[PDB]
């Protein structure tokens with residue numbers, strides 16, 4: 001009874017894909033092997049708000065195998081994989097999540113993780129986008145006092161933590177998992193380099209070769225999106241407000257342009273800025289017939305979807321829609337502006353989510369155990385753990401690490417076992 | 428009389444290439460436009476130890492145009508462009524540098540910059556690899572007291588600064604220019620992606636397509652080298668001691684291997700580690716006939732060249748040599764293990780050196796003006812100047828920056844004019 005999923009009968013399928021996914025997520029299995037006996041999360045009560053995919057299943061069960069009790073919701077109304085949710089619910093784990101939630105239901109699902117039977121309350125939060133963090137701070141401040149800290153998955157959620165802390169609003173420790181090197185430089189980038197393409201294809205089956213595709217933003221996500229579409233023969237355009245990131249794109253042979261200038265020339269538009277209304281009404285009115293528009297950043301407000309309620313909306317299939325302009329021209333909007341990789345496909349593949357999620361588990365162990373050593377600010381995990389995360393993934397893909405001799409360790413000033421780079425190294 | 432170059436009659440050619448190079452180095456010209464009247468380096472006496480190329484010419488004359496007086500040497504015995512040296516000497520600027528120096532001459536050239544006519548002594552150092560910094564600290568400690576600080580170009584020199592500072596040996600402020608974003612992420616990477624290939628070609632004219640090429644190290648330099656050879660159809664192998672960098676290479680589809688395992692299989696070997704004897708005698712003995720071996724890191728000690736004095740060395744052309752093993756098999760060694768892009772070609776092209784060198788000038792202005800605000804540690808320039816450097820290069824390559832609206836600036840928590848990223852952002 002203590003769950004809510006679309007069809008519990010999907011659990012056997014979800015379980016079958018969880019089984020394959022474990023073979024793809026060596027970081028998470030290595031942590032079970034290391035820690036399942038010593039149960040370092042015994043006593044941990046984790047409220048989780050993070051896209052309920054097959055990958056998040058392997059995360060949840062890793063937390064459980066280390067002793068934690070969890071209550072889970074998704075951080076996006078379209079990102080859940082129903083068969084994953086079911087497999088977790090069937091295990092007796094409270095999960096509240098399904099593909100196709102309304103906004104009211106979304107927030108109800110979050111609230112469900114803050115209160116469990118028998119006076120269950122979380123002492124930890126695991127968040128992706130900052131919504132759970134906001135609910136707790138703004139609507140359940142008595143709970144705040146028993147929270148040891150939050151671990152946060154993504155760039156947008158980290159921005160929101162920093163905004164809170166600047167104004168004295170941050171009332172618990174927070175671990176920024178996004179800016180683990182083995183998160184930002186791998187999930188954000190190599191994740192989207194595969195899953196952006198996947199969502200576009202499942203949704204529209206559009207040919208990438210020969211198309212003019214515009215990526216807004218050239219951060220870690222935009223960089224992966226650009227490479228993804230360039231590999232398939234698209235002319236790729238980039239927009240940026242940061243001169244350094246703009247220069248990076250130019251030096252990779254992308255023309256750096258504004259959407260103000262090029263709106264009539266693009267076949268495909270991908271927002272990847274984590275910002276607000278970078279695609280406006282006049283941009284879309286200017287777009288050619290059947291232009292495809294999608295967002296991959298965390299929130300749908302990258303696009304002014306409100307500006308389109310004016311027109312008629314004709315559904316094509318779930319999460320793929322036409323909006324018809326007065327002159328009859330149509331644009332294709334994916335997942336109503338919600339992140340297209342998780343909305344129209346399945347998000348990143350399991351291997352790279354293992355890197356991201358191995359950082360999450362380690363962040364949760366660190367907060368549960370040593371939260372008192374931390375103040376109400378944003379922290380990152382030390383580099384030796386970052387390096388550990390990468391080590392655990394090398395075996396799966398056949399990479400053989402070279403070992404430093406003593407004299408080589410001294411020559412560059414490191415311990416043979418790491419950390420191998422200064423704190424400010426950018427990889 | 429106050430210079431020493433190979434043939435002063437090369438000055439007109441050097442000048443003709445300096446003229447083209449200015450059109451390629453908008454960062455340096457923008458700084459002259461901004462600063463040549465106010466002469467913010469008037470009174471600056473700069474001792475420079477940095478590869479005397481056409482690019483360094485435009486740097487030197489930028490320093491002069493801002494009021495500085497300089498005395499210049501190269502930081503490598505093979506890296507000088509003689510026609511560049513001449514053009515500078517003809518302008519009456521003391522430069523001591525030529526292609527093909529002996530070690531004794533090299534150190535004599537450095538010393539020449541520490542003492543000028545009429546009791547000229549530097550109050551600033553500009554260094555690339557740390558040699559000038561070492562000479563001054565270890566052999567001219569009375570000079571040390573009048574030095575306001577050093578600006579350092581490259582990863583190896585920065586390692587050496589950090590080693591000094593750890594043991595209380597650093598006795599002046601130092602600006603780490605390598606780890607400007609517009610240095611490390613552009614020169615180290617996109618520079619070598621062009622100039623590694625250039626040196627290999629000029630030296631050996633070898634076909635890259637179909638060859639097995641091994642890059643040792645996958646930092647900023649190794650990353651550019653890998654992409655360079657992959658673009659031309661080489662199977663590219665990578666060796667690394669850092670698990671994070673190893674994982675990056677695997678996720679780009681490079682096999683990560685040890686040279687211990689693969690020495691018999693490689694056609695081309697590039698050392699890019701900044702480390703010591705990563706290529707040993709037994710590796711080269713194991714190498715196939717006509718295997719090509721080169722180093723692109725700062726010092727030739729990446730390769731145990733000493734281990735080859737045993738055998739006969741047959742010259743092919745300047746800086747390209749055969750060493751014959753007892754069984755008659757031959758390996759090709761480029762520039763006796765010195766950095767191959769500058770040793771067998773011309774180093775990076777002017778456009779990217781403008782980014783590197785615009786940081787240098789700004790570092791020199793900051794030390795001359797505000798050195799007293801600094802302690803005897805290593806600093807980087809603030810991000811707003813990093814961003815300025817990129818801004819100055821956007822126009823040349825046609826990149827158009829998007830401007831944030833007020834609400835977009837607020838939404839992500841930045842000023843509209845920057846800095847646009849937190850200090851720890853890795854680009």
Ligand SMILES: NC(=O)c1ccc[n+]([C@@H]2O[C@H](COP(=O)([O-])OP(=O)(O)OC[C@H]3O[C@@H](n4cnc5c(N)ncnc54)[C@H](O)[C@@H]3O)[C@@H](O)[C@H]2O)c1
Pocket residue numbers: 154155156157187188191192216217218219220221222239240241242245272273274275278296297298299339340341342347348829831835847
């Ligand atoms: N869908 C996924 O699987 C996934 C994965 C990781 C992150 N994300 C989300 O993607 C978004 C981007 O993340 P990131 O790590 O790349 O962020 P980032 O800060 O590294 O990069 C974003 C870039 O957007 C640029 N930008 C900002 N405003 C702009 C504007 N108005 N026009 C053009 N460019 C602009 C910035 O200069 C910056 O370089 C965030 O919302 C993040 O949470 C999604």
Ligand SMILES: NC(=O)c1ccc[n+]([C@@H]2O[C@H](COP(=O)([O-])OP(=O)(O)OC[C@H]3O[C@@H](n4cnc5c(N)ncnc54)[C@H](O)[C@@H]3O)[C@@H](O)[C@H]2O)c1
Pocket residue numbers: 402404408420581582583584614615618619643644645646647648649666667668669672699700701702705723724725726766767768769774775
């Ligand atoms: N020739 C040029 O134009 C040019 C340009 C920039 C820098 N450099 C020189 O290149 C070298 C590398 O610079 P960088 O910025 O790439 O440094 P970096 O620290 O960014 O990368 C070097 C890499 O070498 C790896 N490494 C260290 N020891 C190793 C070993 N024994 N086996 C395998 N891998 C090993 C490290 O893990 C690291 O990732 C330095 O000497 C630097 O000064 C030359």
Ligand SMILES: Nc1nccc2c1ncn2[C@@H]1C=C(CO)[C@@H](O)[C@H]1O
Pocket residue numbers: 050051052053054055056128129153154155187191297298342346347348349353356
């Ligand atoms: N398959 C998958 N399962 C679970 C979570 C996933 C995912 N694919 C991307 N994600 C996150 C969402 C993004 C933005 O919210 C990133 O931060 C990334 O860490």
Ligand SMILES: Nc1nccc2c1ncn2[C@@H]1C=C(CO)[C@@H](O)[C@H]1O
Pocket residue numbers: 477478479480481482483555556580581582614618724725769773774775776780783
């Ligand atoms: N054409 C050129 N002129 C002048 C200097 C150049 C160069 N090409 C690479 N360099 C440097 C040497 C390397 C290592 O010493 C890097 O740090 C780079 O900044």
